[PDB]
Task: structure prediction
Amino acid sequence: FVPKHPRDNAKGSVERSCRICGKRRGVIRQYRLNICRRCFRERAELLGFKKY
Amino acid sequence: RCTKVRRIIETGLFYAELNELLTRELTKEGYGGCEVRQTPTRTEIIIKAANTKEFVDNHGRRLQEVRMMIQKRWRLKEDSLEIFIDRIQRKGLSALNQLESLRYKLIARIPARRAAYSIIRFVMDAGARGCEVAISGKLRGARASTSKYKEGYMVKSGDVTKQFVTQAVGHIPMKQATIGIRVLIMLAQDPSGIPKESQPDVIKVHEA
Amino acid sequence: VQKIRLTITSSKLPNLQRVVGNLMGKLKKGNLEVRPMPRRRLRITTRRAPCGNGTETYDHFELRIYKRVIDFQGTAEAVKQVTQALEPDVHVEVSVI
Amino acid sequence: MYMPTAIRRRILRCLFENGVLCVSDIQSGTHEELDCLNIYPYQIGRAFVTKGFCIKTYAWSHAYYTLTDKGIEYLRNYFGLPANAPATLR
RNA sequence: AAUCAACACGGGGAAACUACCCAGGACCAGAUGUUUAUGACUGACAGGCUUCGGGUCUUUCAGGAUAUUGUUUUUGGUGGUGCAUGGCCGUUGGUGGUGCGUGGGUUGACCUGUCCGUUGAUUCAGCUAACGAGCGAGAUUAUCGCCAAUUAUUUACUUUGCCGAAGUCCUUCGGUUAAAGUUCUAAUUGGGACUCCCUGCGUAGCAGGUGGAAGAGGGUAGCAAUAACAGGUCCGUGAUGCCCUUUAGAUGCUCUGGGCUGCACGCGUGCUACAAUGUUAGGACAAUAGGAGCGAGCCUGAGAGGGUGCGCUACUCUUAUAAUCCCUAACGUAGUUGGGAUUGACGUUUGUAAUCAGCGUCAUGAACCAGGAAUCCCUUGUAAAUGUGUGUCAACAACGCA
Result:
């Protein structure tokens, strides 16, 4: 366990995953959401985002 | 100590995790959404469900399983968290509740006709202008094929969808294949009930 | 006496306009003297298809942030009473100057 | 799994005291409340479930372990405490 | 993934991780159903083997039931099947369409309702064995443009008054909790445009005109019916059926290194040019974003860069005196001060790593003289030029969204 390669500023750090997804394919870091897009768009209306 | 941006987004992200949590606990109690009140030191949350007795049985032990699960997750202090419950009047017209009734049946091997026209009758008699029920996936054959059962009338377009139309999507895993359940329910406007204003289609002329 | 600022923030405008009415209403009762900040559109522009298939179409998701600032001279006794609205998705930061 | 002995007790006490422990779904993740790797509470949690001492509910990459009737009777046998004896208070 | 509807698409700008692929070496996440307190299993100093080692090995100390052996099968899998499926999305087609109740026609599939002008429109008008209810269209929502109410002297400004500096008799700057406000600034509630008005044409409406901030859906978006495509995605998911993998010399997970960047060649989207309506040198107005990371001012160095870290939880502080254009010079029709590819070296930043990253410096100074047959996009603040933010991001945009 405790993977020894550093991962400070790195794509596969554990912060960088989609929180819901657990996967990192297509991540939204802006406004500190840290959520994958497919994962995002299922549950965007709950967060208070809306189409206009 | 946050920005004016982040206090909105943290509270949004709080709510959506909280709501996906209380899908998976309160399936038996019959969940119907919630509201979150945020204060710097105090948090008050209204859970809403049909079977309010099923909480209060065993002198309110079931709520204290949930309340610790919230408290330990976000590491909030007790006293500073303040959960209530409040009952659903008219279970007929809430979408998440009636989804669960159609989920309850199709596990226990009722035909899909009879499962829909159970709830689609129960919605309309309770008090609603229309409702639609879709049961998408694999019954009988190797190909999947779509049932759609509708009554009343059901508005699909514009802004006026968002105000009037309640809806709820889900799925049932089975021995054979993954079905999808899907129930849209349109409402009547009340005079200041619990929508207020009428549709932008309709107008009413006074009598002379 | 430490002329105090409220700073009222919201996602939704109807839920805001209740709280502004109350916190302006209560300065009528207490009689404290009473003194719109520009709103943000947090636009996030995700590609709406999951896979790479199909014509590249993009949903636009604006979260809106309405923000108002009341402020007044008030003596710490009177201000404790006014602060205590409680609405969904509204915030009120108190700020001493 | 090999746990060390001292960390093992203060998990099963944090289980017994609270009733619900939360742990990140992700393994090799530092754990709050009790400090350790997040493999440690997670892998013991599914051991209890097989025997049937707790219920697992999973949401948003977070695992919740709500402790049932049997596990309350078991952990009095383990720690050696009189009955009554957590977070079922009213 | 392969016509449109694959080919700057998978937000896929891969130096490691990401990562599936290839070469080595570890780990057990071996859950739950005979051995062992007289040590089941576990951790490691130095020096050997070795890419590097408590993987192994010569030594020999540290812990303490969390077990071992065999039997069961959990769980994990970016393994296979999108021709088993859920959801989501593109498309047929955002075109004007779709089909119920009762009645009538037909043996019946089925039809009628849903048919001579008008509209973007099954939009209205009117015909009429049909009459009446729907859904889509419209309405509504969002913003841009014009208004005047409602607030604002420590988050925007203006006027007047004070105190400064120059001018040096009235002009321009900078400052001010100091008096009055709202034309600029910010954003809530309402008003506003309806083919209403006039003239032609044909009741439905159409064309022009006056006025008007705006005139014919005010502009632009958003939302968008039923019915289907074996179109896409099991490489987004604790969405998932079945198949096989778990014989641990693993298709689980992880460490070091390498790949996805390999080039006789063929196509797609783009970028920069072929100059003089230009380049070179010197001089002289934006908007939308984002930010407890942005990074003020002042020093250091040709330059890139470096040091010190003021303000700001933001209409306050900051990225931030944009670039075509304009005005003085230089050049002179040449593969030329056009063009800036490809190569040699030095000076550096980011990073565990520069071996295929970016920036600077001096040298090197290519193909290209407007592009055959073919094809694409576009009607007004549009095309074209011209920059700036943002997404990815430690570092890197010729790309996407604004």
